[PDB]
Specification:
The chain is mostly beta strands. The chain has no helices and 29 strands. Strands 24, 25, 26, 27 and 28 form a five-stranded antiparallel β-sheet that branches. A four-stranded antiparallel β-sheet has the order 3-2-1-29, with no helix packed on it. It has a four-stranded antiparallel β-sheet with strand order 4-5-6-7, with no helix packed on it. Strand 16 and strand 17 form a beta hairpin. It binds magnesium ion (2 copies) and sodium ion. GO terms for molecular function: 6-phosphogluconolactonase activity. Belongs to the cycloisomerase 2 family. One of its GO terms (cellular component) is cytosol. Keywords: Carbohydrate metabolism, Glucose metabolism.
């Protein structure tokens, strides 16, 4: 059943709406040619991070606000039309939600300024129930301006479906929770409980930002915003064991951003902001999971988020300050990038996601 649509992905773009952005923008993106087409948009305030549901029928976005407007919005999504239809919104009761994840039964946010995480059950229609849990953290780190309190920046469900790991930029920790896979809107069971250990500690002043796992779930990789380092870990049965620390940033910019593995697992990419904005490229040793830097690609300004297409052919960079999504072709044998000069104009893009 080959179709033109096979290579056509639906892309969701989250933004900051302090300027001309309406909120969420949707596009068709061809992962074999790099061509794109605008589809629709949704008026949503500060949807700086969003996710599709696993079946692609729903989209959930944060509403990143410093006070009482902090929330999550739930939408019905039509992948073919690229249309978003708001279902409802619920308050996080934790300032600046900046990341979210789902297991199909609950949504979890990382509240940056609240220094907390919020759990929302998902109703039978895909809409959100009011928060069922708000988990507060305590502590600080050595950075005088950035680590005065916990700052939750990432929430990830482990590849074995058993744990939730939450990156805390403010305290140099990855908090660990046990997941109750049965917890849902109907039974009202608690989703998260503190695990053993309650947290993993990383080098002081690192500022843990985003965490990813490899395809078989035996390795994890963390990008540290302040330290500008990538930490490689061995992952097994709810344990993170540090195996290597490498420098993503080499100019002490203290603005590292996002992290992604190529789908074939052969290369790791990590972005840097503020100085020498771009993407560091590492070759992954497939057996021991360690990294060796192989290159660097300068990008537009403020690459807070990027994504790799499922076929591994393109790497798309959201450049918040240049108001563009830059498209790079990947050389699958060297990991190196080539700007194909097919930029997508978007005001303050900060989150890219695909729906197949
Ligand atoms: Mg315990
Ligand atoms: Mg330091
Ligand atoms: Na390049």
């Amino acid at each position: 059943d080959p179709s033109t649509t096979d290579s056509e992905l639906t892309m969701l773009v989250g933004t900051y709406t302090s300027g001309n952005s309406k909120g969420i923008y949707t596009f068709r993106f061809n992962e074999e040619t790099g061509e794109s087409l605008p589809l629709s948009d949704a008026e949503v305030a500060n949807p700086s991070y969003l996710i599709p549901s696993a079946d692609g029928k729903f989209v959930y976005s944060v509403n990143e606000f410093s006070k009482d407007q902090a929330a999550v919005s739930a939408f019905a999504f039509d992948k073919e039309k690229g249309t978003l239809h708001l279902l409802n919104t619920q308050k996080t009761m934790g300032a600046d939600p900046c990341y979210l994840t789902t297991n199909g039964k609950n949504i979890v946010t990382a509240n940056y300024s609240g220094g907390s995480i919020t759990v929302f059950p998902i109703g039978q229609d895909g809409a959100l129930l009011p928060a069922s849990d708000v988990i507060e953290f305590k502590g600080s780190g050595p950075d005088k301006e950035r680590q005065t309190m916990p700052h939750l920046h990432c929430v990830r469900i482990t590849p074995d479906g058993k744990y939730l790991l939450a990156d805390d930029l403010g305290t140099d920790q990855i908090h660990k929770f046990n997941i109750n896979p049965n917890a849902n809107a109907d039974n009202k069971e608690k989703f998260l409980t503190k695990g053993t250990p309650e947290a993993f500690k990383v080098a002081p002043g690192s500022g843990p930002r985003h965490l990813i796992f490899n395809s078989d779930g035996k390795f994890a990789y963390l990008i540290n915003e302040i330290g500008g380092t990538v930490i490689a870990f061995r992952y097994a049965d709810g344990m993170l064991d540090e195996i290597q620390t490498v420098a993503a940033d080499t100019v002490n910019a203290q603005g590292s951003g996002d992290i992604h593995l190529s789908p074939d697992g052969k290369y790791l990419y990590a972005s840097n902001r503020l100085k020498a904005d771009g993407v560091a490229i590492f070759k992954v040793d497939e057996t021991n999971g360690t990294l060796t830097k192989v290159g660097y690609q300068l990008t537009g300004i403020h690459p807070r988020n990027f994504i790799i297409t499922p076929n591994g052919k393109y790497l798309l960079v959201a450049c918040r300050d240049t108001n563009v999504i830059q498209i790079f072709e990947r050389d699958q044998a060297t990991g190196l990038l080539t700007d194909i000069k097919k930029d997508i104009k978007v005001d303050k893009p900060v989150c890219l996601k695909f729906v197949d």
